[PDB]
Amino acid sequence: GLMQFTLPVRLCKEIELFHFDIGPFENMWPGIFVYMVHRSCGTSCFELEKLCRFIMSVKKNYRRVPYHNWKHAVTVAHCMYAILQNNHTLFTDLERKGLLIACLCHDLDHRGFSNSYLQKFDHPLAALYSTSTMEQHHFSQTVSILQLEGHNIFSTLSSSEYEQVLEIIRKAIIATDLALYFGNRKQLEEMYQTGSLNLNNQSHRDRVIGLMMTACDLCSVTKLWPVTKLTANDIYAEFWAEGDEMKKLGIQPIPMMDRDKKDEVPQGQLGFYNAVAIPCYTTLTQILPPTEPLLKACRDNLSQWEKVIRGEE
Ligand SMILES: Cc1ccc(Nc2cncnc2)c(C(=O)Nc2cc(C)nn2-c2ccccc2)n1
Ligand SMILES: [Mg+2]
Ligand SMILES: [Zn+2]
Numbered sequence: 001g002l003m004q005f006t007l008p009v010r011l012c013k014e015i016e017l018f019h020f021d022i023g024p025f026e027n028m029w030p031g032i033f034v035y036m037v038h039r040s041c042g043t044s045c046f047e048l049e050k051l052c053r054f055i056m057s058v059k060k061n062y063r064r065v066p067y068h069n070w071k072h073a074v075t076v077a078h079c080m081y082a083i084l085q086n087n088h089t090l091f092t093d094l095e096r097k098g099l100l101i102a103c104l105c106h107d108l109d110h111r112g113f114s115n116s117y118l119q120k121f122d123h124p125l126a127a128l129y130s131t132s133t134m135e136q137h138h139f140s141q142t143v144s145i146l147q148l149e150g151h152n153i154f155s156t157l158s159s160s161e162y163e164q165v166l167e168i169i170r171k172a173i174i175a176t177d178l179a180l181y182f183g184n185r186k187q188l189e190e191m192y193q194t195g196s197l198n199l200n201n202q203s204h205r206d207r208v209i210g211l212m213m214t215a216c217d218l219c220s221v222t223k224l225w226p227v228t229k230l231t232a233n234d235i236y237a238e239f240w241a242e243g244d245e246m247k248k249l250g251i252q253p254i255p256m257m258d259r260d261k262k263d264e265v266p267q268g269q270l271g272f273y274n275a276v277a278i279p280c281y282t283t284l285t286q287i288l289p290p291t292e293p294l295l296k297a298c299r300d301n302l303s304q305w306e307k308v309i310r311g312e313e
Contacts, residue, residue, distance in 0.1 A: 068110035102172035
């Protein structure tokens with residue numbers, strides 16, 4: 001049990017800031033995760049043998065795609081770690097447990113295509129899960145991995161704690177469906193402004209954990225500008241591949257996905273930040289004030305994209 005994971009000085013200190021980049025050495029990322037779990041959760045909460053075996057099976061089930069890959073999985077888990085460490089006393093044992101696991105698994109087996117594309121293509125996954133298609137698939141992949149031999153990292157929870165944790169995870173993963181985010185943030189904004197928001201109302205915590213999963217998922221926009229700008233090339237690599245594929249079904253795709261409309265990415269990044277990202281981090285900062293660093297970095301990046309449009313870069 002005294003087998004504590006350690007990090008070099010720069011990473012040890014920078015892992016605590018919201019804007020940490022996990023780096024380009026892929027073989028350090030399992031340890032950055034085990035490090036985050038031990039400090040967030042405790043070192044007795046997972047059997048190290050089972051946790052490492054689970055981590056490796058999860059990484060194996062992330063594909064080689066430009067954005068929705070293993071690096072994204074770990075990067076979303078680091079944002080979650082930073083929210084939990086900045087809000088120590090607000091979450092329970094099972095909640096810290098489930099959520100970091102939910103972040104690592106949340107895009108399991110992503111092929112790099114949206115829900116819209118799966119339904120236009122008439123993929124069999126669209127027949128099985130008529131809404132939040134990929135997200136119900138991600139949760140399914142998580143349960144299968146948890147049921148492999150030697151992978152059940154929750155084995156020592158009681159039947160009731162186990163049911164509670166799977167349920168925290170399923171709801172955390174379903175929430176990453178951005179189609180559900182718009183609704184969820186509006187309701188949190190209405191509860192916040194009327195002062196009815198009650199973190200004892202389980203239905204209310206579920207909404208808050210939802211918004212946290214949006215925040216962690218979009219956190220590439222909260223990075224220092226060189227990291228955000230470079231991650232934007234990976235996201236657009238995927239969008240343009242989907243657009244290519246839309247055109248092979250004979251569907252003209254939305255400007256976001258058309259590689260012939262690269263000129264409009266700067267203006268399209270403004271609307272994304274104004275319609276999705278800025279409100280996300282604003283409402284999250286209203287509910288959890290210590291997550292303010294994410295809104296400040298998200299606004300610095302908007303300014304940077306405004307500066308691109310004015311040809312100052
Ligand atoms: C889900 C998601 C995650 C990350 C995203 N970007 C990103 C930027 N910088 C660094 N890392 C990542 C983007 C993104 O660029 N979105 C987007 C652009 C436009 C014109 N529209 N949208 C959009 C997409 C879905 C719903 C509403 C609007 N989307
Ligand atoms: Mg996803
Ligand atoms: Zn994601």
